[PDB]
């Protein structure tokens, strides 16, 4: 079973509060739950914050409801998040489970802070980064020129956000795969990898995930600027999360990219040649 943390996204609101996507963390070692979880951010222990763990291993933030019952939240309150002292962009986060039977267990992940006016560019992974869409060696072929293109998008002030639909067992493999791609010296820009909630079982999926992401930003901005996919269902998911059809790019197994709005056939190489037109520099 999985041991780790699905990358976490946090957005600062214009009233200075913080909203986050759900925290999905799992301790694989821990077995006999019949346990308190502490947090460190950028190598600084966070005081007065703790999570608890369910029998199946998923962790939560305990939060009282108005009936004075403990509710099990995956999304912490803004006051808790403020205690993280997050920096804009990438932050290191560690969760430490203390058990009297199994001792201290540690997992490490990634937590990103964006502002309310940050613009995101979504990329599917399988078939969109990889060429084709359980036995693996990380040698999946990658469409040509995607690293240079995404590098240049990031350089213009957008943030790449990756989307995986693979079972949670592959989550760490997907992170390693993306960070090892090198193409003509170019690499894939660091960013969070979101995971479809169907793959995180506990107690239309891509569309729900992106609407969740859109909704940690305020309603009066459109935070998802563009999206890269390889199936018609990818396009639908982006449209219902606020992407304009002109900014949805759908690639096939021949690495032909259709720019849906202009009904134009292109490629990552050509899109890169037109980067200032299609991904204009943000101030
Ligand atoms: Mg795909």
Automatic annotation (TrEMBL):
Residues engaged in binding Ca(2+): 124, 230, 234
InterPro entries, A to Z: HAD-like_sf (IPR036412), HAD_sf (IPR023214), LIPIN (IPR026058), LNS2 (IPR013209), LNS2/PITP (IPR031315)
Keywords, ordered alphabetically: Calcium, Metal-binding
Domain LNS2/PITP: 120-260
Binding of Mg(2+), residues: 124, 126, 230
Pfam (any one): LNS2
GO molecular function: metal ion binding; phosphatidate phosphatase activity
PANTHER family listed in its UniProt record: LIPIN, PHOSPHATIDATE PHOSPHATASE
Protein name: Nuclear elongation and deformation protein
Species per Swiss-Prot/TrEMBL record: Tetrahymena thermophila (strain SB210)
